[PDB]
Amino acid sequence: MIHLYDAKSFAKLRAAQYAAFHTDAPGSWFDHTSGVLESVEDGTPVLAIGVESGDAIVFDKNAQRIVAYKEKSVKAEDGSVSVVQVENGFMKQGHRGWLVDLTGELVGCSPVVAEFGGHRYASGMVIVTGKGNSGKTPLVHALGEALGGKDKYATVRFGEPLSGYNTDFNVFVDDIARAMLQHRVIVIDSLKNVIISRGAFDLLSDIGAMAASRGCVVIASLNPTSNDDKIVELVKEASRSNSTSLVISTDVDGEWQVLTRTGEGLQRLTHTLQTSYGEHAVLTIHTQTVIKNDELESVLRRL
Amino acid sequence: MIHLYDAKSFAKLRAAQYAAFHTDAPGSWFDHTSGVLESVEDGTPVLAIGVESGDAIVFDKNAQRIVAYKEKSVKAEDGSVSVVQVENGFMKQGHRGWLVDLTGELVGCSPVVAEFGGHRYASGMVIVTGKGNSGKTPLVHALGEALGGKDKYATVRFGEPLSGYNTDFNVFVDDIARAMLQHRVIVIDSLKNVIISRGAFDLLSDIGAMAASRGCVVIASLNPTDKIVELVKEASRSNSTSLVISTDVDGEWQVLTRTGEGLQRLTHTLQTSYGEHAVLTIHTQTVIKNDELESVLRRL
Amino acid sequence: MIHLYDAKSFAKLRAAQYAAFHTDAPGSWFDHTSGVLESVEDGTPVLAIGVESGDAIVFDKNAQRIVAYKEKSVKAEDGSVSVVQVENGFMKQGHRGWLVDLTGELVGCSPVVAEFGGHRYASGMVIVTGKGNSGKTPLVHALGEALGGKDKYATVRFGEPLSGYNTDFNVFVDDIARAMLQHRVIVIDSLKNVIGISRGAFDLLSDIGAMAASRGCVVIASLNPTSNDDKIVELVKEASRSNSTSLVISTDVDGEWQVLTRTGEGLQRLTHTLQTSYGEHAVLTIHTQTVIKNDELESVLRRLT
Amino acid sequence: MIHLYDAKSFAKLRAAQYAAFHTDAPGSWFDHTSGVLESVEDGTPVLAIGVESGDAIVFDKNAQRIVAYKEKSVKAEDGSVSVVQVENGFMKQGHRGWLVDLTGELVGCSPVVAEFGGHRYASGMVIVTGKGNSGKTPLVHALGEALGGKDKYATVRFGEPLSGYNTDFNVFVDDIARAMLQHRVIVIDSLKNVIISRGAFDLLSDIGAMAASRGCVVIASLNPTSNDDKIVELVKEASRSNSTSLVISTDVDGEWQVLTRTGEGLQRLTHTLQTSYGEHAVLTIHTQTVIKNDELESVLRRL
Amino acid sequence: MIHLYDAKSFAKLRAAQYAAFHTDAPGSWFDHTSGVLESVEDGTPVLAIGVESGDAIVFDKNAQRIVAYKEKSVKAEDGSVSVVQVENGFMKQGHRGWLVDLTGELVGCSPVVAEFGGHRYASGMVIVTGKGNSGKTPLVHALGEALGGKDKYATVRFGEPLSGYNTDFNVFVDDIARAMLQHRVIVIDSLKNVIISRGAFDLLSDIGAMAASRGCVVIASLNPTDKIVELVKEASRSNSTSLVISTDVDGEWQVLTRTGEGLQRLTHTLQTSYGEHAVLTIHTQTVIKNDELESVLRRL
Amino acid sequence: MIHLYDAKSFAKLRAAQYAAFHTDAPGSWFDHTSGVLESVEDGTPVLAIGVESGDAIVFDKNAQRIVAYKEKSVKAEDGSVSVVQVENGFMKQGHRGWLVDLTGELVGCSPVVAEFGGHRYASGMVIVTGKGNSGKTPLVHALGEALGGKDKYATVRFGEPLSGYNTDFNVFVDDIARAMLQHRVIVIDSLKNVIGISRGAFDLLSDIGAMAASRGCVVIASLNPTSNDDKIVELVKEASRSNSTSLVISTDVDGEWQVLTRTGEGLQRLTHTLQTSYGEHAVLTIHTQTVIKNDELESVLRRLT
Ligand SMILES: Nc1ncnc2c1ncn2[C@@H]1O[C@H](COP(=O)(O)CP(=O)(O)OP(=O)(O)O)[C@@H](O)[C@H]1O
Ligand SMILES: Nc1ncnc2c1ncn2[C@@H]1O[C@H](COP(=O)(O)CP(=O)(O)OP(=O)(O)O)[C@@H](O)[C@H]1O
Ligand SMILES: Nc1ncnc2c1ncn2[C@@H]1O[C@H](COP(=O)(O)CP(=O)(O)OP(=O)(O)O)[C@@H](O)[C@H]1O
Ligand SMILES: Nc1ncnc2c1ncn2[C@@H]1O[C@H](COP(=O)(O)CP(=O)(O)OP(=O)(O)O)[C@@H](O)[C@H]1O
Ligand SMILES: Nc1ncnc2c1ncn2[C@@H]1O[C@H](COP(=O)(O)CP(=O)(O)OP(=O)(O)O)[C@@H](O)[C@H]1O
Ligand SMILES: Nc1ncnc2c1ncn2[C@@H]1O[C@H](COP(=O)(O)CP(=O)(O)OP(=O)(O)O)[C@@H](O)[C@H]1O
């Protein structure tokens, strides 16, 4: 919905946004949105995600796909009406994203998902990318474990020529929806085959917002392989503006920079990570400064 | 509709256009068009806006979407017939834009929306863009508050990877229609994901006119993040009523304002600074030729 | 239809074409085609114009849109059959353009639409374009008034972020059809969003000049060559060079414009210079025969870069 | 249909092809094909031409469009079957081009259409093009009159912003079909708007063959306007390989080169034309050498 | 179908492939496949070829087009089922190419089609191309006559602005199917208009295999008249069984012949001259590596 | 499905992945997945592969195509539901790839398919490519024989102008499905026409490596990088780099090839050099662990220019 502001109510939002990343307990928002989802009466649609064609599939609170659902109009506070209808396993009426309000007046936030090694990490989508010899796949699994903390992280596998990997986009989005519905920390390996169909474009523009609203983090690997001049800009656009955070490799092997958006129209934070391999290629991450736009664009130009 | 002119009736229009920006009370036009919308008998379509596919959804005066509406033919003054029909939530007959006449003979104007810091600002669409370190999002919220004045401004959020942001274009246009139907000052953050579907092209070409006719202002951020750059330049140059663009110095912005159909564009400079929690404050008439304008556009 | 010629009948056509621009009374052709349209029995389709999709809408002599019309076959002189059918507000059979013969044997002309400041102006489409500081919008309104003369000119507004401007292409073509059906002098502001591409937009660019020249009316359209994208500027150049009957283009000096006029199908293009100035409330006033070769023409077009 | 050859029957074809251009009386072939068309029983389809969509409209011997026609299978000599069917004004079965055999064993010819100023001109399509100040429109009308000789030439008008000009492609092809069905010399002004829809591509590839088979000549103006690098190659391809003859302007105003294909796999002929204007811009053309491929490509590179 | 191999059965295939080009009598394979086609019971589909849309038309052994044919499932040796069905003149089920097995275990061959002037020529598709002043059309007719030998060659004409030339792709493929069904040596003039529709892409990828399986040769002219040049190079390099290309000297041509699946390509030089009425006469084993091959292709 | 991990269960997966390539018996995985397929009750869909249009055809355990199959919902361990439905010979519901779980918790592996000349080779797709004079076709047949070992290898032929070669994409994918369902070692000659693009072709390139690695079979495909068109060579590089489990590429010296093998999802790539020579009738014979970094890998890929 839309929101009205004056100087005073806008100042409050800014303070609340600052708290959502800087002072709230890590994982709080996820726990809150879990409660909201749990309170939804059983069978009610909560999440719609776009399939390859551009149509959408719909899930309930238990991550069960909804095949049929009678038309149902819900009137919001501001007067706006949201209608949801499902027929033959596809969304007839409604929109992509969260079908129940998980956020209320608390919008434009990057809810803190976890704290590791003295740094706070944001929910939403984290893209892991860059060039050089530093491996993406070992990093995303290390990050998934680290941000998981006490909790296990979920792995969605997609589009690699290895055993057990799904390569069908429609199964991929089904896995993602379920992961965001049930887990705080989610790893995607990889985002190469989405990088184009309507579903793929939708996913790139939707997933960051879906995750930030949930309070979960989606850690996606994206190897910038080809040199074709239009596709590299799509990698840069996904890295710059479709991701809540960016994790990018550097000139030195094992070393990564983390760039974190802290909130709608707020300054982006940067910190450096050191890593090393243990037995069987398991990577271990070793244990606040702002960044301007020219520094940001300088980092993007390494891709 | 079409309009006929001779020297005399054209001279009157020019005078009336000049007044609509320079001498009319700020917010007047919005208040007038509010009255026109309020006088529309209940259930009559007033606004149609294009969805992603290129079809259109239709709203009444209360910003309620119309699912069904019997065919209805209205004859204009010039003899042209406008037919409106809605079925299954979509426009069967009609056009995108305002479905009732908000303007009459008063066309080609940039109705003054507000006055702030000694400068008059135009209704229609304002695109906030540019490169460098000056932030777009804090500027649009500061501008929304400033032009709001006594009134609260409306915020439409779209296409950012942050909490509560809608990313579905069809919800986005629903929010916009409602905002223009009910509020004088409107902020859009951001216009990146529209920058391509039929709906997106329609919106870029429609929204400035929709807003200028209403007397409301739509302040939209557009971070120019490689040929599309021309689509950013075209949106900035010719699809926006005003342009707010960053400069070499951080916090400093130039405002370029179209004052009317075939009139000179005005320019003024804004200074800004941040307070607590990254809240931006804007500190408190010269014409610009085309070569100066194109020089400004070439910074994008 | 098609036309047969020998040396003699072709020479007559050339003479008649020369007269249609150089010696006929200004506005004559418009008055003649008005009479032809008026003689059409009521309800008969006269004009079809393409909408955004590429389908066509159809109008009668009174500029009323035709929703339904029984199939009807009309045999021309050369033996060619033109069938017209309309159903559910769209053309089922027929073609875009004039559905009745307004021209007969008199084809390939640029019928003189008006005379102003010692110069004759052609009917058809005039594109007003160019770069520099000289404003397009004030010029088209000044030209509309000047060529209007005793008559008011019609203004079609399209695709600007200002009050009352329609931005829907299908309403735009409805306005244009009505304008050409009822008025000799017509202003379009602006032609940017058609250059911004749909089937209707391509059709309009290729159709409108011929529609207007056949009517004897003039369509004065502004076209600001904004973007530097290398394919779109050629579409501006192509519209200026070959889809317009006349070209009005700005120069290095502010207020000064060159007018390039096609006088007839295989004929030399004429050029003259206009001076202008602003009065009160930004009202522009235009102040009061030489041929041009192709290399001079292409030289003029290369300023649109 | 297909044709079988040995050394001897192939040598005969070559001789017959040589005669069709060099020794046959000018206009002979047209008169012969007129007789063939006249002998077709009334109502039988003779010509199909593609409309904008790529569907085809069909005409009888009198240049009357056929709205409906029962399915009808005709067996050729070699065993090949040609089926023709028309329904709702469009071709259901059949092919684009001539629906009756106008040529028999006499194929690959450029039947002489006329003789003017000591030079023989070929039937088929002549494209008039080039850059510089020499006007295309006055040249095509002068050529139409000259090759017409005793006969009037037909003018098809298309795609110019002048009075009486049709701009609808479907009317354009209707005019062309009628012109080729009834007249030996045909002028098209202009071929700019076809230069893309299926109909336009079809027309460019079809018309030369349609005309050469009829023994009529189609003289089409084509101003090479824009500099866009793919469209100029389409102008070059139409000039080089879709036209039977090419008439192209030179460095000197009023002077034109004519390049004529004399037959399937035969040498191309070249000659120079001088012109001048009389009263009311009427152009007058003033009154055998072979050309190799490198000379031909050199001429094309002026476009 | 698929084939299984070990060292021994693979060695046999290689020997049989070598013989199919180097030692078998010229024209043998054509005569054998003629017998196979003749033994097909009347009305059974034998060949399917793609039309402009990408659908396929189907022919019987007599080169008669099949309008209707009941669904019919044939089980191959490896267990794979081939179903053929035709309805309303188009293939409902099946595949493009030969619908009856003409080859069996004998696959990957270039069956010798003829011997002329001391050189053996392969069946399949021969593309005649190149730049310079040496004419393509006279060469293909000379080659058609020479490889014909005692037999007349068939000429398919397509896409030239000359009398009697068909320009409709669907008639073109009908002519080709009939030619391959009934004749060993076939000339196509020209392959320019196919060089894009689904049918055209299909034909380029299908025809070489169709011809090599039949034991017939398709000699196609292709004048390389700006990126499509790669489509000409790809057709010349990998879609043709043999390549005949002009040289720096007029009348002189190089012939590059694939002798079999994964075998070395052979090269020889041809001299030609014109007689009366532009009739060309061709005057009367060395391997070539890949770098020499790519060097030849770079002249296009 | 999705998998949950902590440090400990992730460490186990890594160890199991290492074993799947380095210590398991060659061909083991194939034999295990054969058993899984054999235990599927008869008539149940096991494999779906995309045809030219982008629709999918479906096969049972015996490599028989399924024309019709009632809707059937199977619930996985994680709660995710997989529905399979076939009608009129095409997949109505389901996904491309394996329709039964062949892998369980054992994912991200490169199951060892064979051992030859002191080197272990991975299952999945091997692309054989490169420039220079070293022949692709003789190499793939030599590799098929060598990795076959005691077993015959299957040959799928596609898109060459030689006798008996199928050129229809829909037959090609039918052959491939059957090959992977019944044989451990599979040769494809060639992969040029799929790079020559339809939905089916794009699907196949992105699907086949995973299909094969999951089965424990190896698909050895030749891919001659012919044309110099700048977008198509990147599609060859992308297929070689990221769509293939292993890469076999020719070198400056004739007969010599480099083999680059992915050992597992987040693991180091291995490299070794092969020498070859021809015997009688052009039969190629291959003569009888070092890791490679990314910059060395990209250096190898840049030879395909
Ligand atoms: N123990 C170890 N030591 C050093 N480097 C290692 C390593 N284990 C893995 N790596 C590196 O990690 C990389 C593997 O991950 P990535 O390259 O980022 C994605 P990928 O597995 O190559 O799939 P892709 O084909 O989609 O790129 C390898 O290039 C390898 O060099
Ligand atoms: N207190 C403060 N002091 C200085 N700069 C600040 C600030 N708060 C925010 N900014 C600047 O404002 C910018 C944020 O606004 P935008 O220009 O719209 C980029 P964004 O919206 O965050 O990402 P996007 O371009 O993907 O939408 C940042 O570049 C940041 O440097
Ligand atoms: N009184 C006056 N004196 C000098 N110049 C004037 C003027 N009134 C108008 N102009 C000039 O006329 C121009 C307006 O016309 P144009 O710029 O050519 C098209 P536009 O109406 O601005 O729409 P566009 O900019 O979206 O294309 C202004 O840029 C201004 O410089
Ligand atoms: N009497 C005359 N003397 C010299 N040149 C003449 C002439 N009459 C006509 N011309 C030339 O002939 C040309 C007109 O024909 P063309 O340019 O070849 C096609 P066009 O009429 O310009 O339509 P186009 O817009 O499609 O190009 C003019 O450029 C003109 O210079
Ligand atoms: N008697 C002769 N002496 C020398 N050259 C001859 C000849 N007869 C024909 N030629 C050459 O053969 C060529 C004709 O064959 P092609 O190379 O196929 C070109 P085309 O088929 O005529 O046009 P196209 O490329 O548009 O198909 C001409 O270039 C001509 O110079
Ligand atoms: N006995 C032998 N000695 C040396 N080289 C041989 C050989 N047998 C085959 N070759 C080489 O192997 C090559 C054949 O394989 P490739 O060229 O790599 C693919 P192809 O089978 O030719 O199909 P393509 O050319 O359409 O891609 C020949 O070019 C030849 O040089």
Numbering used by the authors:
A (entry chain B), D (entry chain B): 1 to 195, 207 to 298, 313 to 328
B (entry chain C), E (entry chain C): 1 to 195, 207 to 236, 240 to 298, 313 to 328
C (entry chain A), F (entry chain A): 1 to 196, 207 to 298, 313 to 329
What's in the article?
The lipid-enveloped bacteriophages of the Cystoviridae family infect Gram-negative bacteria, mainly plant-pathogenic Pseudomonas species and share similarities with the members of the Reoviridae family, including bluetongue virus and rotavirus. Their genome of ∼14 kb consists of three dsRNA segments small (S), medium (M) and large (L), which are sequentially encapsidated as ssRNA precursors into the icosahedrally symmetric procapsid by the packaging NTPase P4 (15–23). P4 is a protein of ∼35 kDa, which can assemble into a hexameric ring. NTP-binding sites are located on the external perimeter of the ring at the interfaces between adjacent subunits, whereas the nucleic acid binding sites are found in the central channel. P4 proteins are the only known RNA-specific helicases belonging to helicase Superfamily 4 (SF4).
To understand this catalytic mechanism in detail, we performed side-directed mutagenesis of the residues in ɸ12 P4 involved in binding the nucleotide ring and analysed the mutants structurally and biochemically. In P4 ɸ12, the strand following the arginine finger motifs extends back into the ATP-binding site contributing two residues (Y288 and S292), which help position the nucleotide ring (see later in the text). A specific feature in ɸ12 P4 is a hydrogen bond between the hydroxyl of S292 and N7 of the purine ring. The substitution S292A did not prevent ATP binding but completely abolished ATPase activity owing to misplacement of the triphosphate moiety in the active site. Hence, purine specificity is achieved by locking the base by hydrogen bonding to the N7 site of a purine. The correct coordination of the base results in the precise alignment of the nucleotide that is essential for catalysis so that UTP is misaligned and not hydrolysed.
